[PDB]
Structures are given as structure tokens and as C-alpha cells.
């Protein structure tokens, strides 16, 4: 009918502790059919962890067999994925995948489910303005600083400007997210016309609206 | 270990055009059972991978006629007959001949425009995190393309590499382009030893570096 996967994660996971993840499906028959184990983060790509075959052996990458079990309930449909000691890279979104038969190649997959192996605790962002140096178009920035988790969400003039805007991807820095937006307007604009940075933290209920005033020499 | 080696990781189109991908594996792919193992999957933003080509050549259920799949043994590669807005994403092969099974490290399949410098921004640290102890030099390169880019900071003449955290955005829907940010953190004490901070970007739209300063003065 509509072979469908879902797992079911913790989401953030601290550093040597374990992952335990669920894999439901509807559509098809564990006893049929077996269902893969797949992750993938910006360092390695997607990775293949392991797999529980429809007559129930498994099979695990050797990378991490030391740390990986596999195991499910035929009746229920469910598929349980645990992986302890977890690390930072250990940080990615993990997929279960149903295996074709005798194609052995993933056909259907879940949508996965973002895992964070972090030891951080919810920390509100600093918000500094971005003015150019003292000494046509003017290109103004915001850097939100040490905030965890992710995501936090930027805005100009409280939505009102929004073309010639770019928010960069978070980037890690001592176990917090920093980022930065800009916005580029007409010269004439700024700072004749007040331009703010809006950043709203919704793990930490803060926001905080930066206007970006000129230097001083 | 088995590699699966992609080529290009980086493809450039026109919608139209055709493409052609490459994969290589460093053991052949041709499975005891004499079937070959070998699939290429598509993943578009957000989404997980979905299957396209299985064994080869077997085009999956709802794939359209202009992907074809073919090679043999160690050598296969993937065609596009003529590349639709839909095709953008990011393509891979996968082994399940040999466990571990891989995957190849993805080839983007991206729009192709005319080649545009990048827009370079540089920002002193702000009075307010200077206020906090803090030192963050941000640099932003944007709306540029290619994507292949460089960029050096030099303080007071000197290259500085560490302390350097770059962030990149995805291709722009609207102008195809893309844009980074560059950002020095440095302790207040680390910043307060130097004068000139330098932000300078090499991209092949120019022989000479863009470049972009200011003096803490």
C-alpha cells in the first residue's frame, strides 16, 4: 500500500552515553523484508551503520560494531537501533531504510531523525551588531553568538526587510553555535533610515533586537 | 576498505544540458551471487535519499526515462539525457556487493550561471562584545560564483589561519549564487596586539585577491 518508515529519537544525547532509536513501519512485514540503518552528517557523508535482515541476523559496519546493536519485534514492526558511547561526531541525522529484497539497496526511507551528541546546556545567544569600519550599496551584519541549541532564527527590521539577506549556517565553537546574518540596502537608506537585526531563540524564550548604529572614528 | 570514488563532486548544468556522473569502486562490485550490486540514489534538500537506479541499469518505480545507468565491474556511471529544474540535488552510488556497504561521497548536481565576483564586507569587532572580553573579526563574501573560493586573514600583514571559522549558504533560488562568511575570533588581548586586520578573497573571476581592511586604530 504505502511502505512507510519512522523513527523515534531523543534528539540530543550527551557525549558517552547511548542512542537508543525506533523504527516503525506500516505498509510491509519485518518477515519480509529488512530494514537498514543509515546516518549522515557534513564530515562523513552518509554512512551505512547496519542492518537486521527479514529473518532476523544482522550485520554491522565494522566501524562500529564494538558500540552498535540492532534488534526488533516482528509483531510490533518495530526496529530498535542502540548505539552507546557516543561522540560529537556521532552528531547527525539517522535513517532506517527499508532493504530491497534481492537488490539489497535502500527503497523506502524515514525521514530520520536529528541526533545532537552535545554535553551543552540551553544557552541564550549574544547579539552584536555589525557596522562597518568608521573609515550604492551598504552592507550591514549581526553575529549571535554562544547559543545552544540550534535553532535560532534572524529577521531584519522585524520581517520588514528581507531581500538582499543572507543568514549563514551555525558554525561550533566550544561546545556552543555561533552564526551571522547580513543584509545589504541602498547607501542611501542607512543610516538615514534605522536598520535592526531581530534574533529570536525560541529553546531559550529570548529574543533581542539589535539596531545597527554607524562607528565613530 | 572499499572506496567509491564520484566524479565530478561538483557538476555545474544547464537545464537542458545532459550529465553524466561517475563512480568507481576500488574492488569490483560484481557479487558472488553474479549479480551487481551497485545503485544511485538523489537527494534533494531536506529530504532523504530516494532510490533512482538499482543494479546498475534497473530504473526504481516513477523514475523517468532520460536517467540511464550502465558500466560493469569496477566502472559505472550515471546520465541524465536533459537536466530539469528537479534533477538539482545531490547524487550518489552505493555498493551492497561488499559490507561495510558504501556510499560514494555524493556528486551536486547545481544551475549553472555566469561566473560573478563576491561582494567582500569586513566588520570590526563590535564595542559590545569587546565589552564582554570577546574579539570576532567577520568577513562576508557574497553572491559570488563559481563556489570555489579562497580566503586569508592577515593581521598586520601576517597570515592568520587559526581561530578562522568559515560558514557557506547553499546555492541562491533566485540569482544562482553563492556566499560565505569568514570570521577570526580572537581573545580582546590577542585583538588589542595588532592593528591592521585584513579580509582578502581569490576567486577566478580576478588574478588579484579582493581585498577589504580597517585599523583597530
Known amino acids: 500500500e504505502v511502505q512507510l518508515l519512522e523513527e523515534s529519537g531523543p534528539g540530543l544525547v550527551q557525549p558517552s552515553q547511548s542512542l537508543s532509536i525506533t523504527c516503525t513501519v506500516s505498509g510491509f512485514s519485518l518477515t519480509s523484508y529488512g530494514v537498514h540503518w543509515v546516518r549522515q552528517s557534513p564530515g562523513k557523508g552518509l554512512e551505512w551503520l547496519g542492518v537486521?535482515?527479514?529473518?532476523?541476523?544482522?550485520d554491522y559496519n565494522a566501524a562500529f560494531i564494538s558500540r552498535l546493536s540492532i534488534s526488533k519485534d516482528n509483531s510490533k514492526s518495530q526496529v530498535f537501533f542502540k548505539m552507546n558511547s557516543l561522540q560529537a561526531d556521532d552528531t547527525a541525522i539517522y535513517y532506517c531504510?527499508?532493504?530491497?529484497?534481492?537488490?539489497?539497496?535502500?527503497?523506502?526511507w524515514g525521514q530520520g531523525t536529528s541526533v545532537t551528541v552535545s554535553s551543552a546546556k540551553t544557552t541564550p545567544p549574544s547579539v552584536y551588531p555589525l557596522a562597518p569600519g568608521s573609515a550604492s550599496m551598504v552592507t550591514l551584519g549581526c553575529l549571535v553568538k554562544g547559543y545552544f541549541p540550534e535553532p535560532v532564527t534572524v529577521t531584519w527590521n522585524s520581517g520588514s526587510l528581507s531581500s538582499g539577506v543572507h543568514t549563514f549556517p551555525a558554525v561550533l565553537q566550544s561546545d556552543l553555535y555561533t552564526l551571522s546574518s547580513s543584509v545589504t540596502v541602498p547607501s542611501s537608506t542607512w543610516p538615514s533610515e534605522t536598520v535592526t537585526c531581530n534574533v529570536a531563540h525560541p529553546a531559550s524564550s529570548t529574543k533581542v533586537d539589535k539596531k545597527i548604529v554607524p562607528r565613530d572614528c | 576498505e572499499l572506496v567509491m570514488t564520484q566524479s565530478p563532486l561538483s557538476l555545474p548544468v544547464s537545464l537542458g544540458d545532459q550529465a553524466s556522473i561517475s563512480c568507481r569502486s576500488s574492488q569490483s562490485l560484481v557479487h558472488s551471487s553474479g549479480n551487481t550490486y551497485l545503485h544511485w540514489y538523489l537527494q534533494k534538500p531536506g529530504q532523504s535519499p530516494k532510490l533512482l537506479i538499482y543494479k546498475v541499469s534497473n530504473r526504481f518505480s516513477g523514475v523517468p526515462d532520460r536517467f540511464s545507468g550502465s558500466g560493469s565491474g569496477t566502472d559505472f556511471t550515471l546520465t541524465i539525457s536533459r537536466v530539469e529544474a528537479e534533477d538539482l540535488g545531490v547524487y550518489y552510488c552505493?555498493?551492497?556487493?561488499?559490507?561495510?556497504?558504501?556510499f560514494g561521497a555524493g556528486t551536486k548536481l547545481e544551475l549553472k550561471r555566469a561566473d560573478a565576483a563576491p561582494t567582500v564586507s569586513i566588520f570590526p569587532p563590535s564595542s559590545e562584545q569587546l565589552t564582554s572580553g570577546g574579539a570576532s573579526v567577520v568577513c562576508f563574501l557574497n553572491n559570488f560564483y563559481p563556489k570555489d573560493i579562497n580566503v586569508k586573514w592577515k593581521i598586520d600583514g601576517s597570515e592568520r589561519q587559526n581561530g578562522v571559522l568559515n560558514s557557506w549558504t547553499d546555492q541562491d533560488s533566485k540569482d544562482s549564487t553563492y556566499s560565505m562568511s569568514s570570521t577570526l575570533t580572537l581573545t580582546k588581548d590577542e585583538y588589542e596586539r595588532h592593528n591592521s586586520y585584513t579580509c582578502e578573497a581569490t576567486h577566478k573571476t580576478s588574478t588579484s585577491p579582493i581585498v577589504k581592511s580597517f585599523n583597530r586604530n
Open positions: 537486521i535482515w527479514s529473518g532476523g541476523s544482522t
Open positions: 531504510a527499508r532493504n530491497r529484497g534481492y537488490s539489497y539497496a535502500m527503497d523506502s
Open positions: 552505493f555498493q551492497g556487493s561488499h559490507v561495510p556497504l558504501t
